[PDB]
Subunit: 377 residues, 3 copies
Amino acid sequence: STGILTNKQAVARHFGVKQSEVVYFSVGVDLGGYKVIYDKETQRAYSLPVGIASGTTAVSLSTAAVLVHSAGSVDLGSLAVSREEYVTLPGSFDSGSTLNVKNELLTYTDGKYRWDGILPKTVAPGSTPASTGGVGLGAWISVGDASLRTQLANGDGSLIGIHPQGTLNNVLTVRTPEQYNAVGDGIADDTSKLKEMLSDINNVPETLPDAAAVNSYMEQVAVKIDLTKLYRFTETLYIPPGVSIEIPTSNFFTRECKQGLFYDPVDKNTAAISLMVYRKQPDGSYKLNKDVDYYPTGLDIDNGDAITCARKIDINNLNLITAPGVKVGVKWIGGAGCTTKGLSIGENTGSDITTARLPRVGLLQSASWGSIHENLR
Amino acid sequence: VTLPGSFDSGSTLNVKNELLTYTDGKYRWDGILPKTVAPGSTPASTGGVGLGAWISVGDASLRTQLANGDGSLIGIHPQGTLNNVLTVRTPEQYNAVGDGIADDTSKLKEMLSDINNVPETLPDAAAVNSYMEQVAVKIDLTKLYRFTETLYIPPGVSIEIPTSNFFTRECKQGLFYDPVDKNTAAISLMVYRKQPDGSYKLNKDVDYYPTGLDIDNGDAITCARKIDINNLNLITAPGVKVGVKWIGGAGCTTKGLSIGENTGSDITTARLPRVGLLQSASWGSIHENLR
Amino acid sequence: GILTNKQAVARHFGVKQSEVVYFSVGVDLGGYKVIYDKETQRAYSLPVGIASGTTAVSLSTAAVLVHSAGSVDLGSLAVSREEY
């Protein structure tokens, strides 16, 4: 009656079409010229494809919105998806729901999703997209601005295309302390951040069973680190194998260090930075050396008394300053084949050396055959 | 208002707020209205996308724009956009598997080709020399790529890996040459050899190396310059004849180039080549800390 | 008047006309998917799981709905559903 007319009006205003451009589905109805079709049973409306000739009549309309007519067939659900004409179902993944059409969206805490798999799709209460098929072609597909924001925020850059081809995640290989929220002002204690940054590269346990265990850590993927601010730390940093450290330029008699590492421990009878050398214990196991004065001898390495875990380490322009009184700057122990360029230790704080930010002993090295220090300062 | 139809069906736009659906999202027309769109049109074939033409609108469009762009939609500090600072190339951009198992040859070759695509056959000396006057690009190798045919490095290429191998038991980053024909080189520079017709062909003979005389009488023309290597690790299947053919690389430079894997006690099954490196016609070349 | 409005609101949200309820003091909220405030002339999806027998107590201009079983800020729910 008038109900049909006022509804057509409601539907039309929603899609931006004309009242006459809306047709109700019914077996045998002429589909020609109409822009939108309304299923009175499900009470859902769908844009019709352009091209239905006059005289083409309706045969059937599935609950998944598949429309069959005298001239052929068409998935109104897929068409709706392509046109971003969606219905956001009540509830959520948490409440559970049942999906019947490709253009139905279910809300999750991080945005909306459509189901690209077999329909109907039942979602049990307490669900998540991961627990109900996962994401991707044939499963759950993220839809809408809210889910785009969360995806970009929690992603790895794979949504960002780059030239000549590929995506952003393909070319981001360098790490920074900023990824770990290091303050970088040389005041705040950035120790935990620096250690996590290194641990994420090569996390080697301080105690290990045998030689095969220790040696295994020299066989991992190497990663480059870029230090562009000033990081104050308070405990000896142990560089694991497979680490490349980089800084734009090297210090040269600089009064105020602005980029690099600042060692400021409570215990000054220690080293700022050390390579990893494992020492044999009575039980037969091995423990990372933490003793400041220790250095392995060739004998120690032959006795099995020591096992180095310092390989594939490269340094470019690292600047290291220390609080006055610190015993040792860098312990280059067991670093065979390891290399350095522009390693710069100590700060030219001022005229009085007793208060200058430099160590008593700059560098201590042993068991480092084939190592090269280029332009060390 | 999303108009009925699409770019496939064609349409006519009359208002600034009308959107026409394409396969990758919606667009409004920012030019002169009314705008007629013939059936079978695409935004690129009907004005292109930009101010005064087709303007991308909505979430679907933003997703595709971002996914197929170059980073120009992303602002960066202190100013400019992402594309302004992405200059390095990687095998991952070509979907290399990087596990040392899958054959990544085609991907690596494509990557090199996208930097400087040098034809294996050239008409003359002038043609060959031109390829040494192209923009150089840096490549970052962070995984392990197995390849099965000799890779020819064209001029204008810089290769880097975070660190260099050193008596490494198991190579984790770099190139692993695993060919069927082991009487070959893993990596080679480009040197062109004169043919009876006067044309030039890329050398692909493992034993060939140019001599000073060869260059002098035009029998050989180098196409190897502006090439720099920092920390490249190269291992090969046991029995591979030559690791690196550094031929004609005048002024070319290396640092931390590391050849061969310390696989185990039996050298017969070690993943290293019979001959590590063969070099000729490379005056002014420098190899720093070659392993 | 009311029926055509329910139609309008239902097509906007994609629900059935009978799944739209007008707010009034005491109205039973069970089973409805959308509620309409005749005063502000605004509609809001209802949180799922409101049992039959749960009646409306009050609806503020800030869209906070108080019913016999508790309360819900329909504005916050709308935000989570990107219904603006």
